[PDB]
């Protein structure tokens, strides 16, 4: 059998960081809320 | 004639004991240098070799014949392969015995055929006994969990070697059920499709008295179903 509990965890820990930092890169730098 | 019998008995039938499939092994016939006194002992020993060749043929036939792709558990199906896995390792002392016979024949070549017969007669009862179990499974198209009860009814008898010999096989075919249950209970993941481990959210999941083992009552089975559905939902 295959499982992903020691494969997908140290990958998703970086996926989520990248996505949230992209949202923050929008807002605190490029000010879409101002537009 | 001596060494030839051992070779035939292991599953290499000679030009003396000619293998057919509608009759097994057969001697070449009356010759003026032989007469029935040795002949009958040889025939009685040849019975066990007939059974052994059939066993190896069946075990070979149902284990290692597909890269695993319906509804089939008797031409295919994990439980059949599990039985075939158990049967050869239970058959290991026979091979060990034949191995012993060659060494004894090497030490002193004048040893009788009755000498072989008395050593092998601890197997003379057990080998017909195990045959009806495999014959039941093949004939009645017994698949899935139903193989367990077929072996289990004859592992409640009154002969110790038959009981232990069947017990090892039942351990193996229990093992496949345990492997499916060990994931489905704590996760919900199942590895089987078109076979049952006696439990097939709140729909596509069915529990049946028919597929469940007779010697495992209904009450524990309902709890198993409850656990799996509960963890599957949240």
């Amino acid at each position: 059998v295959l499982m992903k509990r020691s494969i997908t965890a140290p990958l998703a820990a970086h996926i989520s960081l990248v996505n949230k930092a992209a949202v923050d890169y929008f807002f605190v730098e490029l000010h879409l809320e101002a537009h | 004639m001596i060494h030839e019998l051992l070779l035939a008995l292991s599953g290499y039938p000679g030009s003396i004991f000619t293998w057919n499939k509608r009759s097994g092994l057969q001697v070449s016939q009356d010759f003026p240098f032989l007469h029935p006194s040795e002949t009958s002992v040889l025939n009685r020993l040849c019975r066990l070799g007939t059974d052994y060749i059939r066993f190896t043929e069946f075990i070979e036939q149902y284990t290692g014949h597909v890269q695993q792709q319906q509804g089939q558990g008797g031409l295919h199906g994990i439980y059949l392969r599990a039985f075939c896995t158990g049967l050869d390792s239970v058959l290991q002392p026979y091979r060990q015995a034949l191995l012993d016979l060659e060494q004894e024949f090497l030490g002193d070549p004048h040893l009788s055929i009755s000498h072989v017969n008395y050593f092998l007669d601890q197997f003379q009862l057990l080998f017909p006994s195990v045959m009806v179990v495999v014959e039941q499974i093949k004939s009645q198209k017994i698949h899935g969990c139903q193989i367990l009860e077929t072996v289990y009814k004859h592992s409640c008898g009154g002969l110790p070697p038959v009981r232990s010999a069947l017990e090892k096989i039942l351990a193996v075919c229990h093992g496949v059920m345990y492997k499916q249950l060990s994931a489905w209970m704590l996760h919900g993941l199942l590895l089987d499709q078109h076979e049952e481990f006696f439990i097939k959210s709140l729909k596509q999941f069915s529990l049946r008295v028919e597929i469940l083992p007779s010697y495992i009552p209904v009450r524990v089975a309902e709890k198993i179903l409850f656990v799996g559905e509960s963890v599957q939902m949240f």
């Binding site: 059998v1 990248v18 | 695993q68 392969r81 896995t85 492997k179 590895l191």
Partner: protein, 81 residues
């Protein structure tokens, strides 16, 4: 797919040893676009291949992680442009 289908057979370790190294370069390719921002395709055998920025292709490994990598690389690759 043969691994999750059966593991109660004597041919489990041989096929496991085959897959354990046959999945080795693919793991490296997944480990590239996310940690270094370098998109590395092999022969078309790697699952993901390449103003408004919609110029990357997308045409069994689990698809539930496929799109997450597919978006985790393209933001860094946009910062490269």
């Amino acid at each position: 797919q043969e691994a999750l289908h059966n593991c109660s057979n004597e041919h489990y370790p041989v096929l496991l040893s085959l897959l354990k190294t046959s999945c080795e370069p693919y793991t490296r390719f997944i480990h590239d676009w996310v940690y270094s921002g370098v998109f590395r395709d092999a022969y078309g055998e790697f699952m993901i291949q390449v103003k408004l920025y919609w110029t990357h292709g997308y045409v069994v490994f689990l698809k539930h992680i496929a799109h997450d990598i597919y978006v985790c690389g393209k933001t860094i690759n946009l910062l490269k442009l």
